[PDB]
Ligand SMILES: OC[C@H]1O[C@@H](O)[C@H](O)[C@@H](O)[C@H]1O
């Protein structure tokens with residue numbers, strides 16, 4: 001009986017053309033958001049991803065779906081934040097997705113009323129210093 005919240009827009013501080021953030025909320029687990037392939041800068045990380053709902057919405061957990069094919073951009077250390085208004089963000093948790101190739105769920109112990117969620121990706125798997133990529137990001141209310 002859980003409701004999947006509709007993501008209507010988003011932003012990414014780094015993306016490769018054709019793999020911008022909306023590719024992580026198109027309902028397709030094969031299509032990826034992916035950070036820029038030019039990953040040589042010293043200040044390439046962190047990479048900040050923001051997901052926006054239409055209105056402030058109750059949220060009880062989220063699921064990050066990494067790419068299942070290829071090792072570029074599976075999230076490692078992240079800071080997860082939320083915003084009640086879409087502008088001001090509050091830290092929720094530091095979550096290590098561990099470069100896992102499988103979905104990672106984060107469950108809150110209090111419902112969050114959020115207009116937006118934000119991921120500050122401090123590290124991610126892959127070639128060189130790594131990347132950030134996401135097949136789908138999903139938010140749910142019980
Ligand atoms: O250079 C980065 C790119 O590397 C490719 O091998 C891969 O197919 C892309 O998804 C992207 O990760």
Ligand SMILES: [Ca+2]
Pocket residue numbers: 023024025026027028029030031032033134135136
């Ligand atoms: Ca997708």
